[PDB]
Design a binder for these strands. Structure first.
Lengths: 70, 178
RNA sequence: CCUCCUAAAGAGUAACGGAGGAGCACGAAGGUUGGCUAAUCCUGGUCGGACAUCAGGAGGUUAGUGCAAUGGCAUAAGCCAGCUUGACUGCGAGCGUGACGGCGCGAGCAGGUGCGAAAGCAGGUCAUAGUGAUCCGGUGGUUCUGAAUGGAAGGGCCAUC
RNA sequence: CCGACUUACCAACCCGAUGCAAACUGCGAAUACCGGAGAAUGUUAUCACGGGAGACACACGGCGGGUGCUAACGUCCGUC
RNA sequence: UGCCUGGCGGCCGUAGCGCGGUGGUCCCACCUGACCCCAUGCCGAACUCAGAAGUGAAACGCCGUAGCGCCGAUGGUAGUGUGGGGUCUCCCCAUGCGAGAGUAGGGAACUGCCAGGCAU
RNA sequence: CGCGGGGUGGAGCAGCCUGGUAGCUCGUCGGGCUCAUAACCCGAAGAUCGUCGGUUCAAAUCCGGCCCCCGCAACCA
RNA sequence: AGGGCUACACACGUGCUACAAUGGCGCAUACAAAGAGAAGCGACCUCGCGAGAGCAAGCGGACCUCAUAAAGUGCGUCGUAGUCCGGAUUGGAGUCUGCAACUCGACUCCAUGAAGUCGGAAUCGCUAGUAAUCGUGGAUCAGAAUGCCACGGUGAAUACGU
């Protein structure tokens, strides 16, 4: 026990647990044997439409001509 | 050391009984975790040596023993007695405390690496985890001039064989790579 | 000048016989105390090939050894860290040794020193290589002489170029 | 492109056998060599230091071996 | 006297190695804790310190074992002093010396010292 | 000997006493000129100023020594 | 059908944007011409940082709309510092046109942010509404202009001499 190197080692008390008791581990798939996608969720929202426009409250049944608005 | 308290209190009896062993140091007992880290030589001005020092620094607060190129022969070349890899044979009870994150939920770091298999530890129960990416202590900054990849972690074992090896490393918990 | 053999189991041995090297390096690469053990291949591996590092195993000295070769070694002689400067002066029992010049080796004595609790050790480097007779001149020391006397030169003696 | 179901195909480590060595040894005589104790014989041979040297140009021959063509009334050494 | 551990030995591969089996307060290891001496080119793993329980497992004694290593007869055999011959750097013959390897076979060790436990 | 003097981008030359800046020419590699080629012109590239060390905002330069050359030195019983 | 036409190392011709303090930065503020538009251009409306989004008048063109000219001016502002220029690049989010934006689009936006500090030798255009500069509009066009064509602001130096 040489008393003169090694300055920290333990001071948080090693809290990690799930996501929630300081930092993360999550699921039983906590072996993380792949990279980072950086591109999935929420754009892929669980659904396959990649940003249709601003919300209407009409949303009619069929077809249109945009520059006539009839 | 709570991983090693877990082993004292819970795992030693689990393992003893299930494998039918007759004496406490006949039973499995996890020994002396050690590391390496191999640098791409030290560089002409010993800068990849500095890079050994901060990466060690990441998971041991010490200094390196610092291993030397004893023979130097083929293509990395020269000097045949200059510093190379970064070994720590860690402290005891404290090293087992380190073992509380030191290859348990070391997982948010991991991206895969060539070790940690419940088939390709050696035919002597000795194994080497080359981790790549540093564990994280929680203090300020994350500009370390980083050396991106480091740290073969060579766990040593009261183990001579295949059966004591997978007693450890697998179902002692933490799990091996799935 | 050094190492092997010829060289015939003491050893000296000859040839434009056979085969290699030296003409220093040394302020620690010396001393002492304290500690420590290789080559090599394999099993696994962050990138290096398992063939730069790591752990384990097998191996058991085949490595190391400043510089050829031969002998050597694990008390290491080798590898390392402290303190340290016995790389000591005066001598030297007895000897191997060479025609001689001369070379080598050495317990102890006496002094003064360093390490070591200490017994103990060390008068260089693990050994054999790393050199040059006398003359003359040169600098330094000397309680030696210093031609009538006193001093001086000069010369002697000792240290060294 | 990894790797292996897949050996059909190669030569290393290894294994068994076999041979060789001036500069190879995990082995080793004969003899020669040193010193010691005793017997015998030996006109003390020997051994010290003094006077006087000649000598240092040796060859064939047996025995051992370098060179040579296991040539030379060769050559060089050892032994006799 | 006996059995057993340990220190110090004698002798120093017939003594070693592998292989297989056995033993724990008598002692010995591992062994836990390192506060304090002291110590790690970093590391209480080592060195060092404080020490029970655990445990004979690993180590180490012990016991069995020839696979191995090893020793190893007897005979013959090469070589050789000397002496004699044929001739060639080649042997025979005289008489002395006489190997190395292999064979039969031996072989997992005998032995002094003080201490400690146990048997008595 | 002692003295003096030299030690420049591949190559050959500039800067030198108070110093200030690595210049020039060939050779390079691309451009320009002319309808095209030739040469001509041009841009860029290409250095520790032989070495170490002392100073100022300034050392290529001035100073010692190192390391390296060269001229003279009628010097070594 | 999918790639390719569009690669990229490099050299060359053209246009772009700037290197600033006449300037760049903010607000406020003024006056253009010429055009194009039915399966098109498309206000006002309400959302949206923005592009746009959606609702829908209107237009059939000196009527509506694309469409608010902009530089210039007026005041504040920066103070020569590769910046408060320039903003290419590059990450992420976003709008959009359309079978389909990945090779290979256009556009918004947020963050970050390089070279460029007037440019060898050489070299081109220019005499008057011209040069210089600011912006506008359209044809090709599903979408997709830095270019082409035309439009108008502000508006010059000078040619002594052959």
């Amino acid at each position: 026990m040489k008393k003169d190197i090694h300055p920290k080692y333990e001071e948080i008390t090693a809290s990690c647990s799930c996501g929630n008791v300081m930092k993360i581990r999550s699921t039983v798939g906590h072996d993380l044997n792949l990279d980072v996608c950086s591109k999935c969720h929420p754009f892929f929202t669980g659904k396959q439409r990649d940003v249709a426009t601003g919300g209407r409250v009409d949303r009619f049944n069929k077809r249109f001509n945009i520059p006539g608005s009839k | 050391a709570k991983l090693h308290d877990y082993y004292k209190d819970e795992v030693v009896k689990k393992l003893m009984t299930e494998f039918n062993y007759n004496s406490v140091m006949q039973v499995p007992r996890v020994e002396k975790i050690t590391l390496n880290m191999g640098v791409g030589e030290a560089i002409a001005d010993k800068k990849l040596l500095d890079n050994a020092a901060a990466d060690l620094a990441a998971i041991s607060g010490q200094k390196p023993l610092i291993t030397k190129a004893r023979k130097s022969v083929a293509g990395f070349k020269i000097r045949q007695g200059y510093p190379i890899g970064c070994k720590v044979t860690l402290r005891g009870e404290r090293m087992w405390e380190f073992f509380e994150r030191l290859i348990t939920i070391a997982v948010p770091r991991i991206r895969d690496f060539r070790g940690l298999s419940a088939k390709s530890f050696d035919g002597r129960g000795n194994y080497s985890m080359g981790v790549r990416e540093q564990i994280i202590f929680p203090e300020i900054d994350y500009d370390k001039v980083d050396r991106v990849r480091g740290l073969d972690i060579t766990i040593t074992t009261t183990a001579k064989s295949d059966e004591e090896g997978r007693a450890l490393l697998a179902a002692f918990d933490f799990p091996f790579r799935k």
